[PDB]
Amino acid sequence: ANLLLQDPFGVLKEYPEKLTHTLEVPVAAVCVKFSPRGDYLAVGCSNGAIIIYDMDSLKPIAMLGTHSGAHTRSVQSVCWSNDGRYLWSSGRDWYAKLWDMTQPTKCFQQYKFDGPLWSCHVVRWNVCIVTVVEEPTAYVLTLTDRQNAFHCFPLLEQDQDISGHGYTLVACPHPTIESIIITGTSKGWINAFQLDLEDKIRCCYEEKIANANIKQIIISPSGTRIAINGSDRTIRQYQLIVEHSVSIELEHKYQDIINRLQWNTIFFSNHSGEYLVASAHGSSAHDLYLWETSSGSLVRVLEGADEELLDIDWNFYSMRIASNGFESGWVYMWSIVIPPKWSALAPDFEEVEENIDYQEKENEFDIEEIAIDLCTPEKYDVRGNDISMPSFVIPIDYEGVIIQQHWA
Amino acid sequence: TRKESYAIYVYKVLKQVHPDTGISSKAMSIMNSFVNDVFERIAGEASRLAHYNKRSTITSREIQTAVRLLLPGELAKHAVSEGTKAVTCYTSA
Amino acid sequence: RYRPGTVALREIRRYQKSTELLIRKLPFQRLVREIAQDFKTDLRFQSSAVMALQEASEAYLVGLFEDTNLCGIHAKRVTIMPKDIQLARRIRGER
Amino acid sequence: MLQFDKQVLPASGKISTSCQISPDGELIAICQNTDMLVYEISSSKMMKLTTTHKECINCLCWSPDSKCIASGSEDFTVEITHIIYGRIRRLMGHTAPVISICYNNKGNILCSSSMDESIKEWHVLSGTALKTMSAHSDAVVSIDIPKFDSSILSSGSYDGLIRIFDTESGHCLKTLTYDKDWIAEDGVVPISTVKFSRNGKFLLVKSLDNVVKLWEYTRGTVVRTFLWPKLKYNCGLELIYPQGKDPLVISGNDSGSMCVWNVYSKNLVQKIDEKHRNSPLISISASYDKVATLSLNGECNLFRV
Amino acid sequence: AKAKTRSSRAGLQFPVGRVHRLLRKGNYAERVGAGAPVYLAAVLEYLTAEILELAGNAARDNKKTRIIPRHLQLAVRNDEELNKLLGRVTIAQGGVLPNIQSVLLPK
Amino acid sequence: RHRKVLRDNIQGITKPAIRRLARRGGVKRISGLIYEETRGVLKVFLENVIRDAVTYTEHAKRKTVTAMDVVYALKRQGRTLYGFGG
Amino acid sequence: MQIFVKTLTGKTITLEVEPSDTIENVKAKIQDKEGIPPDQQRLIFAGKQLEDGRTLSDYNIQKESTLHLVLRLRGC
């Protein structure tokens, strides 16, 4: 990532504001999920496809589900491994297909569940937490050393009933602790179960925030702020403190005051969650919102699309916002759009915007052995990212490219 | 006597877009009387609209359906956006 | 075989004397739902609120054709053309 | 520090244009007119291959996983062919000849030059045209991508320019020297070959006056120069990678004399002259430890630290 | 922005004291929402900002500093969607948009 | 259940229908280029009335475009319509 | 020694600092010259965002360099 090192400066602004791309995907799509690096964009589809695009030319590199383990029903969620090599994908076919891009169209392993699925969230590339329909516990799917037995440990202490606290529907693993996973019931309580990765699970937090059907829980990537999306028209960002012993408090609430509408999806910025981005629900909701998570106010509104938007992904490496269409199925994409500069034409050019008063010097009327290294890749970019941990590039299907010229 | 008008409040916006220009009084009486038209045109339509639905309050939701009716095309979308952005800042602070 | 142009005057008087609706119902009620697709998705149309749109579109086109035919006549001919319709709309303010 | 290991190819025959070792460091493709000599370095095995091309193929690009070879020639053909499974794709887009091309570090967008002052871009799987990059005033000779990330595209050309481009949106991004205009001097020595480094933070250039410089483009100025103790060849350049601390630059003279410069100094330590002494050199490449050479007659020469 | 003078709290220039008065002594409806005059002052300021911007632009393009009604007609009628909002209205002392139909030019 | 985006029902405003509509408007000879111009005119009229018809319903939080909302859309553009009430 | 803290839209300042000064010490000097609070300031050098606790020597800031300042105006 060396464009931005000399792009030049003036690209750090922490959101994109112009929509630049539009994946004209005919088969409508629910969930979108970028690669961990800015390379690819997985597109969870309605008719059972999971299209995988290469983000550089807006056209796919494969559509997995040909050889083994096609999601027959609609797919609700897709996450990736920590590197970007595997892919867990939970659909409504009661399966949770873990893919391997090395053998692209062939699923690695799956598992039959108790019903359709809401989501999946990958903690280590094997273990994955999957939300079974209307079950008061989440069955963590740990892909063991043997590929046939995934111990679906109940994510619940043995006797703490949550009847009246609700039913587990979401679970987002904590980034900077990785052993606590916060899970959301359906009547406002939020259970916090710490995996030992034995199976003991301490209930580090059980508390009702409001008597609402929790739709979605997200964590900042520094684990500092946690926001909840109730079934009341409110977003509740908290302040998360854990060493274990965990504790939250109400920082701010977010609501549609005028239109008084529901929130579909919510997402946090890269570093510490200085920005929240939410998608409203009703008619005439044509635009994602932004929020200064400290001041609490609606900073900006990303007026791109034409009709409601469902899923939000924010890959900060590309600084992009993928946002699927609720109606058309098309996948709008915002992007920090740099303009060119003619100061790149010559090594002594300069682009000023004021008629500058050059002051006269005198002579307008008068007529290398330094430290050179080629071995270390750069450790950071202008966003402070974890570059130089080499991402899993896609293996282009070189078993089937040779026919791929002829008839797909 | 004191006969109120929007003389200053138009001037304070002239100093925000074009901070070097001024305005002739005959073209201030126009702006004084342009806003008094758009006021009585928006609050008019936003009071047939709170009465067809048998409400008895002009909320801020009538004023944005009234603006999405009167103001055409791209003045609708912008004046909604600068509408909601200025009521959110009111409630929060 | 009549003279060309006299079945017309036998057809003008016939329609002007009656009050039924001249566009077919179902090819219109489908057009309204096609156009209502843009502004909201999957609307229902309380089925007297399409009759309220034939009777206000038919009575608009007919008042436009009365204003078109006055312009064609004014250009010293008896055949309306699209350079008349665009004039009648430009004079009323519509375009 | 560096010496000769083996010479395995005989010299003469057809026109020898390009030599490229694949990044796995075991499979070498010797580019002659429309035939590809493949040379496995293990037991010094041989392998012959032939393409669907007609004219002198001036370019060669290896796959980053050593599973494809593409090439473009002056007849506007841009062919993509498998190493064992033959011809798979073809692009056909340029309005002037092509001299060199390069793969992405992902292997998905091969960059591609024309000679009519325009670089064009192709996604291989979609086989269509992405972004045009027409910011130059000559036949653009060498367009190189760094080995590690695939962020940027450096364009050196026959008008004497060192211009860095974008690969995402395709604007020119930095210039390191002047043109026909904007100095008017005879200091518009054309550039023959621009090569990035292993990490990709420093650039290497070879101008037509046989003077090699190493640019620190992030700052805008130069930190190394290399001279020999006017050219009319588009001779190859590389920077060898010994496991010692000092990795040496290598270029070929007008004749078949190849000296190797200590890059941590500004001088040489060593020169290779015992081979290629008849024929003049057009290209070189390397690998972790297995560097080849070439000239108009294709004598490949392994060397080692 | 501030805490006094309710327009300050929304960060506007148009008053919300005057508007909220004029929405109750104008008999538009019975009870005026407390959010309502704010949103109404936001729309009014935006239009007064947009019409004073295109007026001022056409005042420097005719070399004059201040704005006379001839500039306000040129700001409205040359625009595509401010002319449509102000379609039926007539700006006093405000000229015409210069146009001549094509067949009137010689040839 | 089923999912159709409509295409080209403006060809339902038929060439004989624009003729009958013209007859009540009292015209004798209709040039053949009218029939793609009236369709242009009607499709513009229907948009502005439906966009105000919808905006009224969408305010009242409904999914049926009732007959009074159509009438208020017409009453706003100075076409008042008298057989549907209020 | 002298620096430029040349801001994003195009104009420059002239400060007097030491290389041993903290970035917050430099962020104090901008606030003395602009009133802009130091918490809303990001100082950018060779593309790298500099931290409040670090010094100018740490980032190889030399005489007459151009630093980049990108304010975040609050709200609304």
Side-chain angles (χ1 to χ4, degrees), chain A residues 1-195 197-408, chain B, chain C residues 1-94, chain D residues 2-184 186-305, chain E residues 1-62 64-106, chain F residues 2 5-6 8-86, chain G residues 1-23 25-62 64-76:
Chain A
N2 316 68
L3 294 188
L4 36 76
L5 187 59
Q6 65 189 355
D7 181 65
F9 49 75
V11 49
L12 283 81
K13 52 172 75 172
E14 311 174 329
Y15 54 97
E17 284 180 345
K18 294 312 305 192
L19 82 170
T20 74
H21 297 152
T22 298
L23 256 56
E24 282 188 10
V25 187
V27 208
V30 186
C31 67
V32 294
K33 202 71 177 70
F34 281 129
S35 172
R37 293 294 183 90
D39 295 333
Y40 320 108
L41 164 62
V43 183
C45 186
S46 73
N47 56 4
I50 298 96
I51 313 104
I52 175 60
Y53 278 82
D54 198 353
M55 197 53 226
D56 60 24
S57 43
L58 298 98
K59 282 186 178 291
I61 37 152
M63 179 195 133
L64 46 99
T66 315
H67 273 150
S68 90
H71 269 316
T72 80
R73 301 315 307 262
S74 165
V75 53
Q76 310 273 253
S77 52
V78 46
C79 300
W80 295 64
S81 44
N82 191 13
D83 51 10
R85 172 167 157 253
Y86 295 120
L87 183 143
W88 279 98
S89 165
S90 285
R92 278 171 168 191
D93 74 327
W94 297 36
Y95 281 151
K97 308 270 171 41
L98 166 65
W99 306 77
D100 189 18
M101 297 298 176
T102 75
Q103 184 66 254
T105 51
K106 192 152 285 179
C107 172
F108 202 69
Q109 200 59 239
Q110 59 269 19
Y111 180 98
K112 187 48 164 276
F113 269 102
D114 196 16
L117 302 185
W118 291 101
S119 172
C120 47
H121 288 279
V122 188
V123 198
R124 301 310 178 101
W125 57 266
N126 42 62
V127 65
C128 167
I129 302 160
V130 172
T131 48
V132 186
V133 277
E134 221 265 330
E135 291 319 298
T137 188
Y139 268 160
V140 305
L141 210 66
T142 174
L143 182 134
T144 57
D145 216 340
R146 40 201 192 279
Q147 295 208 13
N148 280 187
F150 310 146
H151 296 83
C152 56
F153 299 113
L155 193 73
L156 181 45
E157 271 201 356
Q158 325 89 12
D159 312 316
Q160 289 182 356
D161 193 1
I162 60 163
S163 314
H165 300 185
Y167 318 109
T168 67
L169 297 188
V170 206
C172 44
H174 198 298
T176 39
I177 303 302
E178 200 84 19
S179 275
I180 175 176
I181 287 94
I182 45 178
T183 180
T185 58
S186 175
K187 298 179 185 291
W189 294 64
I190 307 99
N191 311 321
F193 288 134
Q194 169 152 23
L195 264 172
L197 297 165
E198 69 270 11
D199 46 338
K200 54 174 291 188
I201 33 173
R202 294 183 289 115
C203 176
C204 319
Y205 216 86
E206 189 169 2
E207 164 266 0
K208 200 186 205 75
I209 48 180
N211 205 324
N213 178 49
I214 303 291
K215 294 180 170 206
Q216 200 175 345
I217 302 184
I218 51 174
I219 320 168
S220 182
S222 54
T224 302
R225 303 205 174 97
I226 166 184
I228 326 291
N229 182 5
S231 172
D232 56 330
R233 324 72 44 84
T234 65
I235 300 297
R236 303 192 177 196
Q237 63 166 353
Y238 295 135
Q239 195 265 327
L240 186 60
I241 287 283
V242 67
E243 307 103 329
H244 308 83
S245 88
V246 71
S247 89
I248 65 180
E249 77 273 38
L250 171 61
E251 277 210 12
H252 297 284
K253 293 183 168 170
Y254 300 112
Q255 289 176 26
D256 208 317
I257 292 98
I258 303 308
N259 211 313
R260 201 165 292 168
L261 273 180
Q262 288 286 347
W263 303 109
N264 283 2
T265 37
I266 41 177
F267 214 80
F268 268 115
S269 82
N270 191 18
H271 274 237
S272 69
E274 305 289 321
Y275 278 79
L276 185 48
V277 48
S279 162
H281 181 104
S283 43
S284 72
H286 285 178
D287 46 358
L288 316 173
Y289 293 171
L290 287 176
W291 274 289
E292 193 77 278
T293 52
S294 201
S295 191
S297 43
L298 171 54
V299 44
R300 174 60 187 168
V301 162
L302 300 196
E303 190 37 80
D306 67 340
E307 55 93 15
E308 199 215 351
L309 307 95
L310 294 176
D311 201 10
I312 298 310
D313 198 2
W314 197 348
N315 200 359
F316 319 108
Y317 299 90
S318 43
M319 276 307 289
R320 260 174 198 137
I321 293 284
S323 69
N324 74 288
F326 161 67
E327 163 179 357
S328 316
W330 277 357
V331 192
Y332 297 91
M333 265 192 299
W334 282 251
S335 283
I336 287 187
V337 53
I338 221 74
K341 275 192 166 197
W342 62 281
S343 178
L345 266 300
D348 222 317
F349 278 0
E350 174 81 5
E351 316 190 1
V352 77
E353 18 269 14
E354 183 178 2
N355 284 331
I356 44 181
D357 257 11
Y358 164 74
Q359 63 270 18
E360 317 97 327
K361 74 183 89 60
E362 179 265 323
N363 43 44
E364 36 185 27
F365 311 94
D366 178 68
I367 291 310
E368 277 286 340
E369 302 289 342
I370 327 101
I372 298 299
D373 55 331
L374 290 184
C375 85
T376 172
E378 313 269 28
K379 193 86 202 66
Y380 288 95
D381 52 2
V382 299
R383 286 83 151 85
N385 292 133
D386 58 337
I387 198 172
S388 74
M389 309 299 180
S391 90
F392 182 81
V393 70
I394 189 75
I396 300 301
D397 50 343
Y398 278 128
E399 171 203 331
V401 293
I402 57 171
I403 181 177
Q404 224 294 312
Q405 166 211 334
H406 292 282
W407 191 255
Chain B
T1 180
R2 314 180 35 84
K3 179 79 167 182
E4 53 250 9
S5 86
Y6 297 21
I8 42 169
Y9 302 117
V10 162
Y11 209 90
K12 286 195 204 161
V13 184
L14 198 41
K15 306 285 102 175
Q16 271 194 0
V17 281
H18 282 194
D20 74 272
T21 185
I23 206 170
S24 48
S25 156
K26 292 293 198 184
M28 161 62 56
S29 291
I30 288 167
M31 298 292 308
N32 172 35
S33 193
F34 158 80
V35 176
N36 281 325
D37 171 43
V38 173
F39 188 87
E40 266 79 356
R41 218 191 292 177
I42 287 174
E45 174 68 34
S47 160
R48 285 161 200 69
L49 209 150
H51 168 73
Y52 296 158
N53 311 315
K54 302 160 82 74
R55 310 262 164 265
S56 64
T57 42
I58 301 187
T59 67
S60 267
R61 165 160 199 244
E62 284 102 12
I63 318 286
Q64 97 171 14
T65 301
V67 160
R68 260 198 286 156
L69 286 183
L70 309 184
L71 298 202
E74 195 77 6
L75 286 170
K77 192 190 297 179
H78 288 342
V80 163
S81 83
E82 212 167 86
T84 71
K85 187 172 73 176
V87 69
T88 298
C89 296
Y90 182 82
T91 62
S92 74
Chain C
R1 309 272 316 199
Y2 279 81
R3 286 290 319 274
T6 320
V7 173
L9 274 77
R10 227 180 82 236
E11 172 185 66
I12 289 190
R13 299 160 156 81
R14 156 159 183 252
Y15 285 127
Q16 278 192 309
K17 207 165 186 288
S18 162
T19 73
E20 86 282 0
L21 291 178
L22 304 169
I23 320 171
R24 296 298 102 198
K25 285 180 176 63
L26 281 196
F28 194 86
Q29 198 206 302
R30 283 204 319 266
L31 164 61
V32 165
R33 287 165 197 275
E34 161 165 347
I35 295 192
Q37 263 182 12
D38 314 352
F39 313 97
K40 183 94 166 178
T41 170
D42 216 338
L43 274 178
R44 311 181 95 75
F45 270 87
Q46 157 157 336
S47 168
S48 89
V50 180
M51 309 327 275
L53 283 177
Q54 278 201 21
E55 277 295 352
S57 90
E58 268 196 19
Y60 168 61
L61 291 195
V62 157
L64 169 84
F65 272 135
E66 275 175 343
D67 303 351
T68 297
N69 175 74
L70 281 180
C71 276
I73 276 175
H74 167 83
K76 286 199 182 303
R77 48 172 171 161
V78 297
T79 305
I80 56 184
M81 282 176 33
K83 77 196 189 79
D84 315 299
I85 275 181
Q86 291 154 28
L87 168 73
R89 301 183 82 239
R90 156 76 182 78
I91 290 174
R92 295 155 99 203
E94 306 205 9
Chain D
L2 175 54
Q3 74 290 334
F4 196 21
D5 289 27
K6 65 193 63 57
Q7 164 55 260
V8 308
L9 294 203
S12 199
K14 277 185 163 183
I15 293 98
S16 299
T17 304
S18 318
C19 83
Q20 295 222 327
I21 303 99
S22 203
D24 63 348
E26 311 169 359
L27 213 73
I28 307 177
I30 303 309
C31 161
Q32 308 181 352
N33 217 318
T34 319
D35 60 311
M36 323 311 296
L37 261 173
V38 197
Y39 164 71
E40 309 85 69
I41 63 175
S42 40
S43 95
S44 189
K45 327 176 188 199
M46 292 311 300
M47 172 50 157
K48 190 66 178 293
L49 262 167
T50 310
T51 79
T52 166
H53 283 324
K54 311 201 306 179
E55 309 182 359
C56 42
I57 34 179
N58 276 310
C59 81
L60 193 52
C61 53
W62 261 113
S63 165
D65 52 349
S66 304
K67 279 172 189 173
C68 187
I69 282 177
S71 163
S73 194
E74 328 299 315
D75 43 347
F76 302 164
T77 183
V78 187
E79 265 282 340
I80 304 98
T81 58
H82 206 279
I83 56 157
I84 48 174
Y85 295 152
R87 174 174 174 267
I88 47 163
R89 299 289 294 168
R90 186 254 315 277
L91 282 169
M92 198 212 310
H94 293 267
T95 314
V98 53
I99 283 295
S100 89
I101 57 185
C102 186
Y103 268 174
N104 220 36
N105 287 324
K106 290 178 295 290
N108 42 5
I109 295 101
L110 77 163
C111 76
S112 66
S113 159
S114 206
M115 297 312 111
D116 57 354
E117 308 158 341
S118 89
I119 294 96
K120 296 167 66 63
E121 292 305 316
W122 319 102
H123 193 203
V124 57
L125 269 53
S126 72
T128 185
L130 316 186
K131 298 309 283 183
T132 317
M133 287 208 278
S134 159
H136 261 288
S137 70
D138 213 325
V140 194
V141 279
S142 42
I143 45 171
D144 188 44
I145 307 306
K147 183 192 208 55
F148 267 23
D149 265 345
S150 88
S151 180
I152 58 179
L153 187 145
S154 52
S155 283
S157 56
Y158 272 164
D159 41 23
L161 275 53
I162 307 292
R163 184 166 287 162
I164 292 175
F165 281 80
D166 175 11
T167 70
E168 202 261 11
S169 83
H171 308 298
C172 90
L173 206 65
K174 176 67 74 68
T175 313
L176 290 182
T177 178
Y178 305 81
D179 49 325
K180 177 180 179 180
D181 278 322
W182 283 100
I183 198 160
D186 211 358
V188 198
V189 48
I191 311 299
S192 46
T193 287
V194 287
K195 287 292 154 214
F196 265 107
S197 57
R198 195 176 140 265
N199 51 10
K201 295 130 58 175
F202 296 168
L203 194 72
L204 265 178
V205 299
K206 182 162 76 174
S207 41
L208 259 291
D209 59 335
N210 214 355
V211 190
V212 173
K213 320 172 187 175
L214 184 139
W215 286 98
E216 265 205 353
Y217 58 90
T218 303
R219 292 190 201 180
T221 176
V222 77
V223 285
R224 286 301 181 280
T225 186
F226 305 115
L227 56 98
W228 222 283
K230 264 299 168 191
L231 175 72
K232 269 92 78 173
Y233 291 122
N234 303 331
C235 167
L237 189 136
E238 221 270 324
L239 190 149
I240 202 156
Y241 290 139
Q243 315 315 307
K245 189 43 188 190
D246 215 339
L248 263 60
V249 199
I250 171 64
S251 87
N253 207 335
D254 286 80
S255 67
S257 88
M258 294 82 55
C259 61
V260 282
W261 282 274
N262 183 290
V263 78
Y264 290 172
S265 80
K266 296 172 84 56
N267 53 82
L268 302 152
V269 304
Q270 173 164 7
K271 168 178 196 162
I272 291 292
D273 202 14
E274 74 203 326
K275 286 304 166 317
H276 275 298
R277 73 192 86 91
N278 54 8
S279 52
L281 302 215
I282 185 165
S283 89
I284 40 180
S285 189
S287 161
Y288 179 86
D289 257 6
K290 294 303 170 201
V291 42
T293 73
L294 213 78
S295 70
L296 298 194
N297 300 118
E299 319 150 42
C300 79
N301 297 309
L302 291 184
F303 303 96
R304 194 197 46 243
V305 53
Chain E
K2 258 139 77 179
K4 287 294 273 306
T5 68
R6 296 169 67 188
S7 85
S8 305
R9 282 153 68 159
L12 306 162
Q13 321 295 320
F14 271 63
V16 205
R18 160 152 318 153
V19 164
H20 180 90
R21 168 161 61 95
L22 296 187
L23 279 189
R24 286 180 301 181
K25 308 210 159 25
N27 284 311
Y28 298 87
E30 187 169 18
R31 296 151 26 119
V32 170
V38 174
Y39 202 103
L40 185 46
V43 178
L44 289 190
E45 164 188 303
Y46 173 54
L47 283 170
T48 305
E50 182 124 358
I51 193 48
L52 279 187
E53 185 162 0
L54 292 166
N57 281 288
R60 282 190 285 103
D61 297 340
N62 303 346
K64 282 158 197 176
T65 50
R66 67 195 33 172
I67 291 185
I68 66 185
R70 176 59 218 202
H71 300 99
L72 281 155
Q73 184 98 31
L74 281 168
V76 179
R77 301 304 196 267
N78 265 320
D79 203 336
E80 172 86 340
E81 298 175 357
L82 258 170
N83 170 46
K84 187 183 294 180
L85 154 75
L86 292 176
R88 290 267 74 215
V89 85
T90 289
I91 290 167
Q93 212 81 38
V96 187
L97 253 276
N99 58 358
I100 310 152
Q101 284 88 18
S102 184
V103 301
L104 305 183
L105 269 301
Chain F
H2 54 62
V5 44
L6 284 168
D8 280 318
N9 313 314
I10 193 65
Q11 302 296 329
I13 310 297
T14 329
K15 166 185 182 297
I18 309 178
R19 164 175 322 279
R20 312 205 290 257
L21 268 182
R23 295 316 183 197
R24 177 175 292 180
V27 82
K28 206 169 154 182
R29 292 181 105 267
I30 317 162
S31 175
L33 317 172
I34 287 301
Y35 306 137
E36 293 286 335
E37 183 54 47
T38 303
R39 298 218 192 86
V41 163
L42 170 74
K43 197 182 77 210
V44 165
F45 178 79
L46 286 176
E47 277 187 355
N48 298 119
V49 177
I50 284 185
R51 162 191 305 149
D52 304 352
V54 160
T55 309
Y56 272 106
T57 66
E58 181 178 353
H59 177 99
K61 284 172 159 185
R62 273 178 289 109
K63 274 88 175 176
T64 73
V65 185
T66 175
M68 289 298 293
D69 297 347
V70 166
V71 163
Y72 290 139
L74 297 167
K75 191 202 270 168
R76 196 199 138 267
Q77 301 177 357
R79 307 208 179 277
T80 314
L81 183 64
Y82 293 175
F84 303 79
Chain G
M1 45 75 65
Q2 203 216 54
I3 52 180
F4 305 108
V5 205
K6 174 254 289 179
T7 322
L8 278 164
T9 319
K11 295 180 182 297
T12 78
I13 333 166
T14 41
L15 285 181
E16 55 284 337
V17 298
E18 294 74 21
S20 87
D21 263 5
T22 88
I23 294 304
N25 195 338
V26 181
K27 288 190 168 179
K29 295 173 188 287
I30 305 298
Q31 186 179 27
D32 300 312
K33 293 203 76 152
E34 260 278 22
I36 188 72
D39 48 15
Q40 289 172 256
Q41 303 171 24
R42 307 171 185 278
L43 286 176
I44 306 286
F45 188 71
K48 183 186 181 77
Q49 192 166 247
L50 316 186
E51 288 180 340
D52 259 347
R54 311 276 199 178
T55 186
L56 279 84
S57 183
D58 190 15
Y59 298 116
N60 195 7
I61 303 153
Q62 63 152 61
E64 287 250 349
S65 303
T66 164
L67 199 56
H68 301 276
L69 174 61
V70 51
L71 318 176
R72 317 153 37 186
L73 270 297
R74 283 303 196 96
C76 183

